[PDB]
RNA sequence: ACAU
DNA sequence: CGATGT
């Protein structure tokens, strides 16, 4: 219905899919960039969307914030709920880094608790999520 | 189909 | 047009 402005919005950006992946989190109200991950040479859109949510969970937990997280990724929201990122990306030498980060994100989810609501950003009604890369 |  | 996912 309405945008919860008191929230964190996250998104992936990429050069190719699979390709170079990065992500960031922004204050939904102001657009202030709160975190940005250094580009990862090969990953998928969904792996990056997943890492962005998990990073958001960790960022908010560390700061004792109860804000929700918005993501525009149906897939990544489900992977976080399941604590399991069901990516199809080949596990090989060139994908080792993204897969390490994904495995470590799952590991964090499996060893920590959170109440953070993870909400679908309704692009069809609200436009692009505020963390979008404009590309 | 829906979401990226 | 191609891709990643449920
Ligand atoms: K989108
Ligand atoms: K498809
Ligand atoms: Mn997105
Ligand atoms: Mn794993
Ligand atoms: Mn985007
Ligand atoms: Mn885009």
For residues A56 and A127, give the distance between their C-alpha atoms in angstroms, rounded to a whole number: 21
Beta bridge partners of A18: none
Q: Is the CB of A45 under 7 A from strand C?
A: yes
Q: Is the dihedral of CA A85, A89, A90, A94 positive or negative?
A: negative
Per the entry, the structure determination technique was X-ray
Distance of CA A117 to the CA centre of its chain: 13
For residues A32 and A95, give the distance between their C-alpha atoms in angstroms, rounded to a whole number: 31
Nearest nucleotide by C1' position to the A124 CA atom = B3
**CATH code of A132's domain:** 3.30.420.10
Q: How many domains does chain A have?
A: 1
Residue A83 belongs to domain spanning:
1-135
Residues whose CB falls within 8 Å of the CB of residue A87, separated by 6 or more in sequence, listed in order: A44, A46, A47, A102
Beta bridge partners of A35: A25
| Among the listed residues A53, A65, A47, the one whose alpha carbon sits nearest the alpha carbon of residue A108 | A53
- Cα(A68) to centroid(ligand 3), Å: 16
The tokens describing A40, both together, are 């990862």
Long-range contacts, stretch A108-111, CB < 8 angstroms, 24+ apart: A108/A54, A108/A58, A109/A54, A109/A57, A109/A80, A109/A83, A110/A83
For residues A19 and A7, give the distance between their C-alpha atoms in angstroms, rounded to a whole number: 29
- Residues 64-103, chain A: which have Cβ under 7 A from strand C? 74-75, 78-79, 86-89
């Amino acid at each position: 219905e309405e945008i919860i402005w008191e929230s964190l919005s996250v998104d992936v950006g990429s050069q190719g899919n699979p390709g170079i992946v990065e992500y960031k989190g922004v204050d939904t109200k102001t657009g202030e960039v709160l975190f940005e991950r250094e580009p990862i040479p090969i990953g998928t859109n969904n792996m990056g969307e997943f890492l962005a949510i998990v990073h958001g969970l960790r960022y908010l937990k560390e700061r004792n914030s109860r804000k929700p997280i918005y993501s525009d990724s149906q897939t990544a929201i489900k992977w976080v709920k399941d604590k399991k990122a069901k990516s199809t990306l080949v596990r090989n030498e060139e994908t080792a880094l993204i897969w390490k980060l994904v495995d470590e994100a799952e590991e964090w989810l499996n060893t920590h608790t959170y109440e953070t609501p993870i909400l679908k950003w309704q692009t069809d009604k609200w436009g692009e999520i505020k963390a979008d890369y404009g590309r």
